Design a protein around this ligand. Structure first.
Ligand SMILES: O=c1ccn([C@H]2C[C@H](O)[C@@H](CO)O2)c(=O)[nH]1
Ligand SMILES: [Zn+2]
Length: 111
């Protein structure tokens, strides 16, 4: 529907690893963008994706402090460089699983 789009793929900002695509953004509670803080007070602009790749999911899930009701999280690192890119979420409903990735740790560009 658009020739030569420059904004279709998300890659790891620190190394280039393919991570997700704009077509895979997922509006959780009506918005694909959720702004949250961890217990250390860090603010994150979290983009929700249905699907992602090139990550490494660390350990087992935890429900503690989850920003998304009904889901447990696993830390998602870039599988190539180890940069912490976000979290994989599971154990919930409609959808069962998704990714919440930290927007400013990704780079957007052409396929
Ligand atoms: O939904 C989530 C996912 C992660 N964290 C925090 C917990 C932990 O301190 C750190 C792990 O990335 O992020 C949350 O607060 N909520
Ligand atoms: Zn990386």
């Amino acid at each position: 529907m658009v020739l030569a789009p420059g904004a279709s793929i998300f890659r790891c900002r620190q190394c280039g690893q393919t991570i997700s695509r704009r077509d895979w953004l997922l509006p959780m509670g009506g918005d694909h963008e959720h702004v949250v803080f961890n217990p250390a007070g860090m603010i994150f602009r979290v983009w929700c994706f249905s699907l992602a790749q090139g990550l490494r999911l660390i350990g087992a899930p935890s429900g503690e402090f989850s920003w998304f009701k009904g889901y447990d999280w696993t830390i998602a690192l870039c599988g190539q460089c180890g940069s912490h890119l976000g979290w994989h979420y599971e154990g919930g409903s409609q959808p069962q699983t998704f990714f919440g990735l930290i927007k400013d740790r990704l780079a957007e560009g052409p396929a």
